[PDB]
Amino acid sequence: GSEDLIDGIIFAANYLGSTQLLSERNPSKNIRMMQAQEAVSRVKRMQKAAKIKKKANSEGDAQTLTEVDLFISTQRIKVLNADTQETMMDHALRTISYIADIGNIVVLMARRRMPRSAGKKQYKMICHVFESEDAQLIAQSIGQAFSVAYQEFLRANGINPEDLSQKEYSDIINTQEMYNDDLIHFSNSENCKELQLEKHKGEILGVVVVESSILPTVILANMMNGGPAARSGKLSIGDQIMSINGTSLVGLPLATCQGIIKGLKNQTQVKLNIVSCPPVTETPLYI
């Protein structure tokens, strides 16, 4: 249990679902425990409805949960579709804020970076729920992964345990997460305009350029009307896009960013965070 965690190990499990949640900035581990159990209740109660909707068989008969490969390494935690091997989630080992087994269930929690919105939980946690006969071992193995990552940090940098313990190691990692949360959370620089677009099915908005120049590497608006895009105004060619239905865009290529605008097809309710204030200090492609 060390040499192996570097290459990784795969545990089988059933992905029941994920849920976002509101949270205080930096709560206790006991509070994180509450959050996880509320997350698991919501997902289980949703799966229960899903099973019903499934029994009534519209057309196909796709299951409500999905068998997955739970990859674990000192570097990350990847959930892959057991059969298609398509990646469903890839979390840098350092982004996991809370992991735990609750019976035969494993919950993975992570901070959801996102510009705030105008008592109240102002921060957002994303919570992934899995089921496995080996929930206990998965949790233990992930824990073991943190330690080997630590030991490998000292080694790789020629540092000795007596100087940097694993606790300070954790603290360093949390601080960095916390910082990045705060960063994007208050990125409400000069115009965190929250939008709400309407759409139906298959249809799409349009296409725009990106690459903001060290700044909130987001995306700049660039044409495409008629469809939902400009159909509601409140948008401008040159308005930086921060988030899209939950996931931030600060620090992302185009395969993911422009890939999301491709996944909004069957939405009918798209959330967006734009800073706008443009536009100065072939042709075309929808999707």
Phi, then psi, of 193 in degrees rounded to 5: -75, 120
Q: Closest Cα partner for 260 from 236, 243, 281? A: 243
Joined together, the tokens standing for residue 201 give 């099915």
- Which of 68, 88, 66, 76 lies closest to 11, judged by CA? 68
CA distance 132 to 148: 24
| Bridge partners, residue 124, by sequence | 22
* Segments of the chain assigned to CATH 2.30.42.10: 188-281
Residues paired with 125 in a beta bridge: 21, 111
**Residue 3 CB neighbour total at 10 angstroms:** 7
3 state SS of 67: strand
Q: Which residues in the chain are classed under CATH 2.30.29.30?
A: 1-187
Backbone angles phi, psi at 141, to 5 degrees: -65, -40
Alpha helix locations (H) across 75-165?
135-157
The three-point CA angle 280-217-240 to 5° equals 45
Distance CA 181, CA 185 (A): 6
Q: Is the four-CA dihedral 168, 174, 178, 179 of positive or negative sign?
A: positive
User: How determined?
Assistant: X-ray
- Resolution (angstroms) equals 2.7
Nearest Cα neighbor of 15 from 99, 105, 102 is 105
Q: Is the peptide bond preceding residue 284 cis, with omega within 30 degrees of 0?
A: yes
Name the token pair of 20: 């976002």
Which helix (H) or strand (E) segment is 103 a member of? none
Q: Which residue has the tokens 């949790």?
A: 139
Instruction: For CA atoms 169, 182, 111, 43, give the dihedral sign.
Output: positive
CATH of domain 188-281: 2.30.42.10
CA–CA separation, 73 vs 82, rounded Å?
18
Tell me phi and psi for residue 5, to 5 degrees: -65, -10
> How far apart are alpha carbons 220 and 205 in whole angstroms?
14
CB–CB of 127/4 below 8 Å? Answer: no
Level-2 CATH architecture, domain 1-187: Roll (2.30)
Give the separation between CA 122 and CA 120, rounded to whole angstroms: 6
